[PDB]
Every structure is written in C-alpha cells, then in structure tokens.
Curated annotation (Swiss-Prot), chain A:
A motif (DEVH box) lies at residues 332-335. Residues 433-584 form the Helicase C-terminal domain. Changing T68P: In TTD2; mild; wild-type dual incision, opening around damaged DNA and transcription by TFIIH. The TFIIH core complex from patient XP11BE (a patient with XP/CS who has a C-terminal splice-site frameshift from residue 741 in this protein) reconstitutes in vitro transcription about 30% less well than wild-type but does not restore NER in vitro or in vivo. The XP11BE TFIIH complex has all the subunits in the same stoichiometry as wild-type. Purified mutant protein has very weak 3'-5' helicase and ATPase activities. In another paper the mutant protein has wild-type 3'-5' helicase activity. The mutation is recessive to wild-type. Conventional DNA helicases unwind DNA by binding to a ssDNA overhang of dsDNA and then translocating on this strand with cycles of ATP binding and hydrolysis to 'unzip' the dsDNA. XPB/ERCC3 is believed to be an unconventional DNA helicase principally because it translocates in a 3'-5' direction along dsDNA instead of ssDNA, thus it is referred to as a DNA translocase. Keywords: ATP-binding, Cockayne syndrome, Deafness, Disease variant, DNA damage, DNA repair, DNA-binding, Dwarfism, Helicase, Host-virus interaction, Hydrolase, Ichthyosis, Isomerase, Nucleotide-binding, Nucleus, Phosphoprotein, Transcription, Transcription regulation, Xeroderma pigmentosum. GO terms for biological process: apoptotic process; DNA repair; DNA topological change; embryonic organ development; hair cell differentiation; nucleotide-excision repair; positive regulation of apoptotic process; protein localization. Pfam families: ERCC3_RAD25_C, Helicase_C_3, ResIII. Residues 218-379 form the Helicase ATP-binding domain. This is General transcription and DNA repair factor IIH helicase/translocase subunit XPB.
Curated annotation (Swiss-Prot), chain B:
The keyword Zinc applies. Keywords: DNA damage, DNA repair, Metal-binding, Nucleus, Transcription, Transcription regulation, Zinc, Zinc-finger. Its main location: nucleus. Pfam families: Tfb4. This is General transcription factor IIH subunit 3. Disulfide bonds: none annotated. The gene is GTF2H3. Component of the general transcription and DNA repair factor IIH (TFIIH) core complex, which is involved in general and transcription-coupled nucleotide excision repair (NER) of damaged DNA and, when complexed to CAK, in RNA transcription by RNA polymerase II. In NER, TFIIH acts by opening DNA around the lesion to allow the excision of the damaged oligonucleotide and its replacement by a new DNA fragment. In transcription, TFIIH has an essential role in transcription initiation. GO terms for molecular function: RNA polymerase II general transcription initiation factor activity; zinc ion binding. It is found in: Nucleus. Belongs to the TFB4 family. Part of a TFIID-containing RNA polymerase II pre-initiation complex that is composed of TBP and at least GTF2A1, GTF2A2, GTF2E1, GTF2E2, GTF2F1, GTF2H2, GTF2H3, GTF2H4, GTF2H5, GTF2B, TCEA1, ERCC2, ERCC3, TAF1, TAF2, TAF3, TAF4, TAF5, TAF6, TAF7, TAF8, TAF9, TAF10, TAF11, TAF12 and TAF13. Component of the 7-subunit TFIIH core complex composed of XPB/ERCC3, XPD/ERCC2, GTF2H1, GTF2H2, GTF2H3, GTF2H4 and GTF2H5, which is active in NER.
Curated annotation (Swiss-Prot), chain D:
Component of the general transcription and DNA repair factor IIH (TFIIH) core complex, which is involved in general and transcription-coupled nucleotide excision repair (NER) of damaged DNA and, when complexed to CAK, in RNA transcription by RNA polymerase II. In NER, TFIIH acts by opening DNA around the lesion to allow the excision of the damaged oligonucleotide and its replacement by a new DNA fragment. In transcription, TFIIH has an essential role in transcription initiation. Stimulates the ATPase activity of TFIIH subunit XPB/ERCC3. It comes from Homo sapiens. InterPro entries: Tfb2_C, TFIIH_p52/Tfb2. The keyword ATP-binding does not apply. GO terms for biological process: DNA repair; nucleotide-excision repair; transcription by RNA polymerase II. The C-terminus (residues 305-462) stimulates the ATPase activity of XPB/ERCC3. This is General transcription factor IIH subunit 4. Pfam families: Tfb2, Tfb2_C. One of its GO terms (molecular function) is double-stranded DNA binding. Belongs to the TFB2 family. One of its GO terms (cellular component) is nucleus.
Length: 604, 258, 52, 434
DNA sequence: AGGTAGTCACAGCTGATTGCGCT
DNA sequence: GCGCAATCAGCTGTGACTACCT
C-alpha cells in the first residue's frame, strides 16, 4: 500500500512469523503465493498449491503462484473443503494469512454448488438446491429469454427450469457476473439412459505419475468435470485423452485443428484403446466411413461451424450428430477456442463433459479468461522443469544468438517504415551465414534439424540457396507427408524447412535442433509450440534475430512464457569458427546484389 | 575456496619405541611427536581453511589425538600432548599382540574424512590426504582389511603418503602406488622434520610444480588364505579368486559358500 | 576478390560486439584460469560448436 | 589495493621494523603464494644461503613463470635477500629477524602477544558473541548510513573528515552536510571485508598527518587479526597514540569496549576478517533477499526495481532500465556481479557457477549499451594537397602524442584541442621554411 | 491531448469445378 | 465416355499496422 521505493510493501499486514521459518510459503494480501523449492516439504506444498491455485512462474528456486476465483472453484470442486484449505494455508504461511484472503476465499467458495447445469433428453436445465436463488436471478433480463415458452414454473420434485440451447454461452457468461458460477458434473456411473459403449483400453499402455495425478484430479469423487489439462507435446497428451475416454465409457467426440490431426487421434485410439474400426469414424469429408451409428467420432474445427451451404452427405451427418448426447467431448489445441466461429461449436453440439487439451495456453487478445466459462477451470498445469528432470522430457538448451545488421541493409531498414522492413531483417546476410554455419555443424554432428521460417517469400531464396527440402504450405497433401516421412529414416537428408505449417500439433518426427528465423511478432504460443516440437543436453534450439531491429524486441517479448516455464535463453554473440570455412555471401558484391532482389517486391 | 585436510597416522607401537629408547639413539618418540606437531602447525599455517587430524595407532586401539606462538596452535599442541600422555601412560600390555593396528587407524581416518566432507559447504571442495609414519614392522594378518581400506581411499580419491622410518612395508608401498601418494624411506631419523616439510608438506596441486623423488620399487606379493604369508607363486581359484600356497583338490572357500 | 573477402570479414565479425569485447580482453586477466571448477562449468554451459 | 601492493611501496626500514612482531610475520606469510610458502618453510631451518640455480631447479620448467612471480614477490617484500656467496655465486637466505619471529610464532618462545588477561579476573559486564556481532553490525550500518547522509546516523567529525579525505563525499559549502560521490556508491557496492581493508589502507596512508607510527598500527592490526573471538585482552602496554587508534576502531565497530577508561577490549568478527548469503538469483531476473536491514534494501534497490517487501523477505526484479540508471550513477557491471556473487544464498552455491551465466551476460551487455558511442573532441585536418606533406604532419603529431585518429588513404587526421595550436604553428613554420 | 474496425501477410478448412488416364 | 485426383473460390484464424472522435 505504501510506495516508498515504488514497491507494494506488506510488512505490517502479515507479521505472524511465530517460529520461525519452517513453512516455505509467503502469501500476499491482494493475492499471490511464493513457494521455496529448496524445502523438505516441497513436494507436499507443491501438491497443495496445484490443487488450489495456478502457477504464474516456476523458476529453479522460488515458484510463484496466483490465487484466482476459478482456481478456488476448481479446488472446491475436488473433495477439499473450505475449512481444510484455510487451515492448511494457515499451517504453511510463515507470515500469517492477511485478512483480505480469508474473506476472498470464503466468498469464492460459498457459491459453488448453488447452481448446476444438467443435460437430459437433449434438453438443458439449470437446477438449484436452494429455491430462493431462482427468484434472485429471475429479474435478470438476459436470463428471461432462455425460457420458452416462459417456462411458467417447471414444477419438479429443488427448483429447475429449461434454458435455450443456443443461448447457453450467454447464461454461462452472466452467471459468474452474478456470483453463481455453473458446474459441469457428469455422474457417468449411474445414467441408465445413455447407451454406454464397450470401449476398454489395453492393459499395456502405462502412464506416468503426473498423468495419474491429472486424471485423478479429473475424477475426484467418481464423476467427471469439464476442465483443461496442459501438457507438453513431447509428453503424453493423447494418452491422457484416450484414458479419459475409456474411463468415461460413453460416446466420444474428438475435435482437432488440422485435417491430419484426426488421423493422429485415430492412430492413438487404435493403439491404446482396442476399439473395432466399425465404431471409430472420421468425419472430415474425405472418406465418410459411415459416421452414422458410431461410438467414437473424430473430426476437426472449421467444419462443424460452417455458415455457408454444406454438402448433402455432410448435412445429414450433422443432422444426425445434433440429435443425441455426447460423452466427454474432447477438444485439441484448446488455446485457439475463443474465436469468432470456434466458440459457437460448443453451442452447436450437446455434450456432458468437455475436456480440453493443449500445450501452450498463452494467447493474445486476453481471451483466455473467456475459456474459463467456455469449457471450465484450468485443471492441471504440468511443471516442465521437474518433468525434464525426470528424463522423460528432453532438456533443450535454449539459445538466442543474434547477428549484426550488414551496412548494405541497415540503411534501407532505417529508410523505410511502411511494413516493407520485414524482408530486410528477415534476409540479413549475417543471419543467413549464421544459419548456414549452424546447419553445416549440426549435419556434421548428425542431428535432425527443423528450420522454422515465416514470410515464405524469403524462405524460398533461403532454402533454394542451400538446395534443401522445404514446405511452402500451399503445395499438396502427399508431398508434405512423404517429405516428413522420409525426413526421419534417411541418413542422407536430415534437415527440413517449415513455413508456419508446424505451428500446430502434427506428426513431425523426433529432432534435436530447431532454428527459427523471422517468426510472428509476439506469438508466445507459436514459439512455445515450436519448442514443443523438439522435446520428447539431449537437444537444443536456436533463435536468430537481427540487432537494432524490431526483431530484437519481438524475441524479448515472446520468450517471457518460456522463462515463466523455467527456461533460460543464453545469448550467443560470436560463433566459433565462423571464418574457418567458406559460407555464402562471403563478399560484398552478392550482399549488395541481394538488395535489388529483396526490394523487388514493390507490392503496391 | 581451496580446503586441504591432512590426517597424520603415527605408529605409536610401544615395543619399537622402547627398543629405540634402549638403543640410546639420537631419535626418540618424543622427537617424532614434536616433528609431527611442527608439521601440523606448518600445514595449519599454509592456509586458514586447512584442517588437521592426528591419529595414533597402538596395540590396543587408535586414539584421536586431535606463550609467544599462535593461540590455536598452543591449544592444539596441548591437546595432542595430553592425549599422547594419556594413551601411553595408561597403555597396559594385556596379551601377546604385537602388530600395529594400522588398518584400523586408516579406517578411522577414512571415516573422519567422510564426516568432514559432508560438513563442508557445497561451494568448496575438500581435498583430503592421509600421511602415515611407520616405525614398527608391517602386519601380514590384516592384508585383506588393508586392501579394502586402500580401495575405499582410491574410490573417494584420497592420497595416502607413507614415511617409513626403519623397515619398509609392502602394504604402504601398494597404498602409495594405488592411490598416487608418495612413498619415502627416511635415511637419517633425526632429520625427519626436514623430510616431512620438504616432501609431504605441499598438496597434490603443488606437487606437480615441484620435483619429487621417484617412487621406490613397489612389490605386489599376495597373501595366502591359509597362511596369511606373502608369496610369489601360488594357486588361485577360478571362481572365488582365492589364493592358496599349495594345490588342493577342493577349494575351501567355495566349499564354505553354499 | 581477396581484398573484398578481408573487408567483408572485418565489417561482419567485429561490427558491434567486438570493438569493446576485444579491447576488454586485451585489458583482461591474460594469465591462467582461476580454478579448474570454473573451466568445467564453462565447458558444461558452452554449446558444442563453441567448444571446437 | 591489497596488502602486498601497500607493503611493496614501503621503505626497507619500515619492512624490517614490521618483522619485529611475530604476528606480522605470520600475516605476511599467509599472503604469499602457495609456491612461496613451501620455499619459506623449506628454508626455515637453514643458516646458510642457497644458490639461485639450486632454488630454481626445484620447480619444473613448465611452471617457471609461477616460480619467477613468487621470487619477485619475495624480493619485493624483502622476506629474503640475495647474499654474495663466495665464488661469484649469489646465495639466497631468509631475513634473520623475519625467520626468528616466524619460528617464535610457530614453535614458541618469548612472551605472549598480549600482556595478560586474568590479572583483572572475569569481566563484570562481559557480553556474548551474538551481542558483539549485533554491535558490530549496528556500527557498520550507522557508518554506511552516514555515508548516505540520513539524520539517523550521527558520527564524529573526524570520521566525516576522513571520509571526505577518501574522496567518497565532498563538502561544497561549509556547514551543509556533504554529498556522496560516485566513488562513494562504488565503495558501498564493495564487499564489507574489502570495504574494511580499503578504509584501513586509507587510514595508514593518512596516518602521517596525525603523527602516528605506521609500524605500531600495522603490528597491532595484525595482532587483532589473529585474536580469538569472544576473548578480551589488556589495553595496557600500548602508547597513547595507539589509544586513539583503538578508540577509532571501537567507533568503527571492529573492537568492542564498554568505556574509554576500560582496560578490556573484545575483538569482533569483523576484526578477524580484516586480515582477508541471503540473495537468491533466478533466471527470470528476480532477486529474493532474506534481509530486514534498510542497508541491504538500499544496496539492492540501487541497481534493481523493488517489487515486494515481506517482513523477512525482499522480492526485486533486475530490469534493463534499473541497471542503466545504476551504471549512469557510476557503478560498473563487474561490481554488481561481484556483489551478487558475494551475497549469494547457500542454496545457489550448489550450481556451478553460482550465478547463472545468462544473467551475468545480460548485465554485461546492458553495461555496454551506455558506451556504444565514443566521443572525442578534436580538430580535423583534411586540406592536404600532397601525400608527402600529410605524412610529415602525421609523424609530428604522433611525436607530440596528440593524434586521435588517422586515415592515410584519404589523408585525414584528428588532433586533440590542446595540441591543435602546436600543430598549427608547426604547419605555419613548415610553409614558411619551404 | 490519447485508443479500435479495416487491411495485409500467411496458413488452415471445406464446397464445388476440371483437365488427365484406358488390360 | 466414366472415374480419380489436382485446382480454385470462399470463408476463417493470428498477429501486426493504420486513419478519425471524447
Ligand atoms: Zn596356502
Ligand atoms: Zn574357490
């Protein structure tokens, strides 16, 4: 509250430092938790904090977590009660809980189970234990449109009433503003109305303890609740979804991002679920393997939310699909859920549990907050540092090596400002030489190399100069698949170029070296995804930027997610043996010739 | 950040020192103790962080021995003098045992070094070495225990230096050669302190800088299982690797194991 | 040509972060390393292409 | 500056007088290199000089540079002196006084360094080691606050004058409190044992103004260095000049004493360290300090942005702007790195190195940002009609030592403003002589 | 005296057309 | 002549740059 040095000091607020330091935790009045990792009780404190709060940074020594209303909702969703969490937080405080958190925790946890949402006979109902709250929200104008025709009293038994199916998102957004958040609990143990399927995973696909913890938190009291699980791409992500689908034992719907991720999910199901191919169906307008009458359906976005005319067969498939309940609707790459057309997808299908999986939950436009009510609370957030300490995740040695701007290019860079400077620092001759040197070194040491490069116009001359395979992106489907398939099991070729195509969950093979050049501006999601394509110092990835350009600021502002995850970006300013061998653009003649071909765009 | 620990094992066998005293020679046990104390004081003066330990071996057991001069040295010397007086004055010959318990003293030194290593802060490395001065004859009964001690010292990278006074010991030569220590036989006993300060005073890093006498001819004669005597040619079992002086139709050790 | 190669190398390899780093190195320790522990840590934290 | 640098600049007579105290010889010995100590110990019991070649042959050829450095340091400290050995050879033998005092300090002999301690019996108002440490820390914090200028710190006028003499603070106008200079900030950033030693060196340099014997002060300081913590000694047996120095040390917190007339004085932990962790540093440019005193808070806030202040914790963020501001204040990046390394928490000691390389590299790169542009005032000459004429003027300027930059290809040269007049006069004379 | 719908780049998807192959 | 695969139109997501009102 005091600003003697510009720092919020709370010395007087929390003086309960009785005896004496044995509790490795610090609380903040507004809200924050600081955890000391070098403590004998580190594991238990970490388990307690994960179940109640989401992390904000996990460096090697002092973790920092944040307390949010949705985190407390998730905590109270599990068997943890208000008294237990309060007494255990007071147990490990070392400073005393300020009287702004206990009131906040109490207010958040009081209104959890008052309002519930249920699905029955393809109808959405809102049920409340206390009848008074219904009259409390009756005067709200937005809610009154949901009922039709006005739902005079909907006398049952406990007071509940029907709501408009297509306006469920609006009421979900309103309820949290009304301090009456909705809960999505599916008691699949006793339904007797939904036709459960005979899916059963093979008893040979073992899972790691963190996956066990995530699943156990998903099923806390014998029921499944909608949530989000964040795991690295290299780690086991599809396995968690398959296990959840098997445990739910209901008709499963899987949504992917690309037309190739559906094949990935089908392969995962065929590998770890022992499901006959008749029940498995893929609905992506490619083979149409009779999706009508199926147990497990896999499809992708941008197909369930078409606002234009649809195919005749696809129309009938959608009509059939929108006439029955769904069990554990699984969404992949949940981070790009809050979109103009992707949000309505959850409103176009009916499901009991909505499970979202992703590796990079960070996104711009601050629309991640909407995901709290679109699907549910952030359930699990894996700790990447301890994950790679166990050896199951490759310990990637991050590097941020920059190159000076050549004199023939910096003049043009400072001369132009109307969006024409991207190619100038993208095609820096010094950065080109650094990339070529890294390629040659890691080919001499026999490491698989993936070079990410947006602005495919530059990538053309970047790849044809070295005469190496590249993926333009609008090429074809077979060519990309065959290139990626022969990239792994071929000693002759061990380096590929990707232009914004690998910025999603694909089937790229294991690689040890990743080099990114001229990516998007501040896409922390993109850089985190690119890093995820390497881990699965076993590996290491480099980022090349041009000094005294906007790319420096972009690289600085895009790595904050990874440093929050615990990674450190070493700065490399000199490359050993740069002049030992011959590289391209050795003389100034071709460097100044490059100016004409890089200014030859003239997109006017 | 460089910490050096020196453990000095003193062969305090009463029989050999009594014979030396009866010889009325210029060298006695008192002069040996004084030289050891001076060497310890020099080691402590070399650096502040240097740690010193002194263990005296006797027929009974091993004793942990640890105005105008340094205050800590004055306290250190008094404790060593009191301990050596208490050990020798209260030493009563009870039995026919005469061989020095050199192996037990080395084991205690290793345990003490292991204890001290843990107490060191993780920012510093505790370079440890053991110096042994030998006066009595070597004991062939403790061959296996001595070899185990040598291997344990080698595993933890602890130098073992031997300063033989009268009779060369093959066990000490093997310990010096295996662990990389320095083995030296004293030509003139009264000049012991000068030899200790000239040879064994520098640490391993400093020994590289200096020129030191070449290692003496180290022997590797093995000890028979049924005789506990050094031999050159003997029979060795192919299963348990036990060594026997004479051929036997059946291996005793393999018969013991079931 | 040969002169152009040397000119380009001089411009590139020492543009911003050498005109001061090289001068500092000329005014640096010069002698041997502090301890062997420092060298081991540096080798561990250095990249494979920087150790050749 | 270290002890060896100060000892090297002393006259031989002062060095000879210093060796008369056994404590001084031990302190000098412990400051020697590792190779030098072995040579001193080997020559401890020698009454005859040794040939220089014989001493040189002890060390191997590959390590001859270290041997030469050790020999040069020993010669500079005058521990041993070259002796004219008969036969044309040069013999090396230790100083007899130094050798005798070293043997007394090691083997024993003479009287104790202190007069006596049991003459007055137990102390009526004896303190404890934690109390002594608290008193020393409070005195040091008071001194450092007086360096800042807070009214809560009140010290003697002589201490303020000494600080002014050290250059840390300047008094532009009499009466008004002095202002701390950039050297004051650099000294504050220094480690406490380094700060104590620098202050003591300044005191020794300025002692001749107060008419105090350098040898006696150095001997007493070295004796205090080897004193046992928690054990008092008799004040008596010292000159009245040494009494003022003892009172100054008591004001500095090195030595505790209940009253000026008291016959007892208790050396503190600072006094012992005069002979020679709470900060956790994270890869995300965050400092977690386990401190409560305002001194460490100010020191950290000098080069970082404060975020949170828990009653027993300080959470700060090391940002580019804060480091740039601190460097503009006069603190170099190397000093910041050394300060962070010294105050490193014991947990960080496991990591090798203790400070993560990325943070140190980023700090160093931030330091280089301020001095990216180099500014050198001067006068440019570009009106050379002939190549030969340019070369002669360039050579003359180099002789005068005023040349800043030269370019023979375009016949361009830059001279210092001070040397511009000389070059102009030379050029005028050359044209007249032509 | 200080902030958001068009606009641009680069990818994705699905809904048709549309020339190419033939024991 | 029929059938399969290549191709484009239209719509959308992601991130960043830019011209008029409280
Ligand atoms: Zn035998
Ligand atoms: Zn056998």
């Amino acid at each position: 509250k005091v600003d003697e040095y510009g720092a919020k000091d709370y010395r007087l607020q929390m003086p309960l430092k009785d005896d004496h330091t044995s509790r490795p935790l610090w609380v903040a009045p507004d809200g924050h938790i600081f955890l000391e990792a070098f403590s004998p009780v580190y594991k238990y404190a970490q388990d307690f904090l994960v179940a109640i709060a989401e992390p904000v940074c996990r460096p090697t020594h002092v973790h920092e977590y944040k307390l949010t209303a949705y985190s407390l909702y998730a905590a109270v969703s599990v068997g943890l009660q208000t008294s237990d969490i309060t007494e255990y937080l007071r147990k490990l405080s070392k400073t005393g809980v300020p009287d702004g958190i206990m009131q906040f925790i109490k207010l958040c946890t009081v209104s959890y189970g008052k309002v519930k949402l249920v699905l029955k006979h393809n109808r959405y109902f809102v049920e409340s234990c206390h009848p008074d709250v219904i009259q409390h929200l009756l005067q709200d104008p937005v809610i009154r449109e949901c009922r039709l025709r006005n739902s005079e009293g909907e006398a049952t038994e406990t007071v509940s009433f029907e709501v408009k199916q297509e306006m469920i998102e609006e009421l979900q957004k309103r309820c949290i503003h009304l301090e009456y958040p909705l809960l999505a609990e599916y008691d699949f143990r006793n339904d007797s109305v939904n036709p459960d399927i005979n899916i059963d995973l093979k008893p040979t696909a073992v899972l790691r303890p963190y996956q066990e913890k995530s699943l156990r938190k998903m099923f806390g009291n014998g029921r499944a609740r909608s949530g989000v699980i964040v795991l690295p791409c290299g780690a086991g992500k599809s396995l968690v979804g398959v296990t959840a689908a098997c445990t739910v034992r209901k008709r499963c719907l899987v949504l992917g991002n690309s037309a190739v991720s559906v094949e990935q999910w089908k392969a995962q199901f065929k590998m770890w679920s022992t499901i006959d191919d008749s029940q498995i169906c893929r609905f992506t307008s490619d083979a149409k393997d009779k999706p009508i009458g199926c147990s497990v359906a896999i499809s992708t976005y941008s197909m369930l939310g078409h606002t234009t005319k649809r195919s005749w067969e696809a129309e009938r498939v959608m009509e059939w699909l929108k006439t029955q309940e769904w069990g554990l609707m699984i969404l992949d790459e949940v981070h790009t859920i809050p979109a103009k057309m992707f949000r309505r997808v959850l409103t176009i299908v009916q499901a009991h549990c909505k499970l979202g999986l992703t590796a990079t939950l960070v996104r711009e436009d601050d629309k991640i907050v909407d995901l709290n009510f679109l699907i549910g609370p952030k359930l699990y957030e894996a700790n990447w540092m301890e994950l790679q300490n166990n050896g199951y995740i490759a310990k990637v040695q991050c590097a941020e090596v920059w190159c000076p701007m050549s004199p023939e290019f910096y003049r043009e860079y400072v001369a132009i400002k109307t969006k024409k400077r991207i190619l100038l620092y993208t095609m820096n001759p010094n950065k080109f030489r650094a990339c070529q040197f890294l390629i040659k070194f890691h080919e001499r040491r026999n490491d698989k190399i993936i070079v990410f490069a947006d602005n495919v116009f530059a990538l053309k001359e970047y790849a044809i100069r070295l005469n190496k395979p590249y993926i333009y992106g609008p090429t074809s489907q077979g060519e990309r698949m065959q290139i990626l398939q022969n990239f792994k099991h071929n000693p002759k070729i061990n380096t590929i170029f990707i232009s914004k195509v690998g910025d999603t969950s694909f089937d790229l093979p294991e690689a040890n070296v990743l080099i990114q050049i001229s990516s998007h501006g501040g896409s922390r999601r993109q850089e985190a995804q690119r890093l995820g394509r390497v881990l699965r110092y076993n590996a290491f990835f480099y980022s090349l930027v041009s000094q005294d350009t906007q790319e420096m600021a972009y690289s600085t502002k895009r790595q904050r997610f990874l440093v929050d995850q615990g990674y450190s970006f070493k700065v490399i300013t000199k490359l050993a043996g740069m002049e030992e061998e011959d590289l391209a653009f050795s003389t100034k003649e071709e460097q100044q010739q490059l100016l004409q071909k890089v200014l030859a765009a003239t997109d006017l | 950040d460089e910490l050096n620990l020196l453990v000095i094992v003193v062969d305090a066998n009463p029989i050999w020192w009594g014979k030396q005293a009866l010889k009325e020679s210029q060298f006695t046990l008192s002069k040996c103790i004084d030289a050891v104390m001076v060497l310890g004081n020099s080691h402590l003066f070399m650096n502040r962080s240097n740690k010193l330990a002194v263990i005296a071996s006797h027929i009974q057991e091993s004793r942990f021995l640890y105005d105008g001069k340094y205050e800590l040295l004055t306290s250190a010397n008094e404790v060593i003098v009191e301990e050596i007086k208490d050990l020798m004055t209260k030493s009563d010959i009870k039995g026919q045992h005469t061989e020095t318990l050199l192996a037990g003293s080395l084991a205690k030194a290793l345990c003490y070094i292991h204890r001290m290593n843990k107490e060191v802060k993780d920012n510093q490395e505790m370079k440890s070495r053991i110096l042994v001065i030998k006066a009595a004859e070597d004991s062939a009964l403790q061959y296996m225990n001595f070899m185990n001690v040598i291997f344990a010292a080698q595993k933890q990278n602890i130098l073992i230096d031997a300063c033989v006074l009268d009779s060369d010991s093959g066990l000490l030569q093997q310990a010096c050669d295996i662990t990389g220590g320095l083995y030296l036989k004293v030509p003139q006993m009264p000049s012991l302190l000068q030899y200790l300060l000239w040879v064994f005073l520098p640490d391993q890093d400093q020994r590289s800088q200096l020129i030191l006498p070449p290692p003496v001819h180290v022997d590797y004669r093995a000890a028979c299982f049924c005789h506990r005597n050094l031999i050159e040619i003997g029979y060795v079992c192919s299963v348990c690797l036990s060594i026997f002086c004479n051929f036997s139709p059946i291996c005793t050790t393999c018969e013991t194991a079931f | 040509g040969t002169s152009s190669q040397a000119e380009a190398a001089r411009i590139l390899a020492a543009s911003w972060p050498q005109n001061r780093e090289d001068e500092e190195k000329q005014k640096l320790k010069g002698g041997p390393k502090k301890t062997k522990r420092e060298k081991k840590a540096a080798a561990s934290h250095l990249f494979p292409f920087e150790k050749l | 500056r270290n002890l060896q640098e100060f000892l090297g600049g002393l006259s031989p007579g002062v060095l000879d007088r210093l060796y008369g105290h056994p404590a001084t010889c031990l302190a000098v010995f412990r400051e020697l290199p590792s190779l030098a100590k072995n040579w001193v110990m080997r020559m401890l019991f020698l009454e005859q000089p040794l040939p220089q070649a014989a001493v040189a042959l002890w060390v191997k050829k590959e390590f001859s540079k270290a041997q030469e450095e050790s020999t040069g340091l020993l010669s500079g400290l005058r521990i041993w002196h070259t002796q004219l050995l008969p036969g044309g050879l040069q013999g090396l033998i230790l100083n007899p006084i130094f050798r005798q005092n070293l043997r007394i300090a090691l083997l024993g002999g003479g009287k104790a360094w202190s007069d006596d301690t049991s003459q007055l019996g137990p102390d009526k108002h004896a303190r404890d080691v934690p109390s002594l440490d608290k008193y020393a820390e409070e005195r040091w914090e008071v001194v450092l606050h007086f360096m800042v200028g807070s009214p809560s710190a009140a010290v003697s006028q002589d201490l303020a004058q000494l600080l002014s003499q050290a250059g840390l603070m300047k008094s532009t106008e009499p009466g008004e409190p002095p202002c701390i200079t950039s050297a004051g900030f650099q000294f504050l950033l220094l480690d406490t044992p380094a700060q104590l030693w620098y202050f003591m060196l300044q005191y020794l340099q300025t002692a001749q103004s107060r008419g105090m014997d350098l040898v006696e002060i150095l001997s007493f300081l070295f004796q205090l260095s080897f004193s046992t913590l928690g054990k008092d000694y008799s004040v008596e047996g010292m000159s009245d000049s040494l009494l003022n120095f003892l009172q100054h040390l008591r004001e500095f917190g090195l030595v505790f004493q209940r009253k000026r007339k008291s016959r007892r004085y208790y050396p503190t932990r600072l006094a012992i360290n005069l002979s020679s962790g709470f900060i956790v540093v994270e890869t995300n440019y965050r400092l977690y300090a386990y401190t409560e005193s305002e001194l460490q808070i100010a020191l950290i806030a000098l080069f970082s942005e404060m975020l949170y202040r828990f009653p027993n914790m300080v959470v700060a963020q090391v940002t580019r702007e804060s480091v740039q501001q601190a460097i503009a204040s006069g603190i170099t990046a190397q000093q910041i790195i050394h300060f962070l390394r010294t105050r490193a928490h014991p947990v960080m000691l496991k990591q090798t190195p203790v400070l993560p390389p990325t943070i140190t590299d980023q700090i160093r790169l931030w330091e280089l940002e301020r001095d990216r542009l180099r500014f050198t005032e001067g006068v440019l000459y570009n009106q050379f009609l002939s190549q030969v004429d340019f070369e002669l003027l360039l050579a003359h300027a180099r002789e005068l030592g005023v040349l800043v930059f030269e370019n023979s290809a375009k016949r361009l040269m830059v001279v210092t403003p001070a040397g511009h007049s000389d070059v102009k006069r030379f050029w005028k004379r050359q044209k007249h002589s032509s």
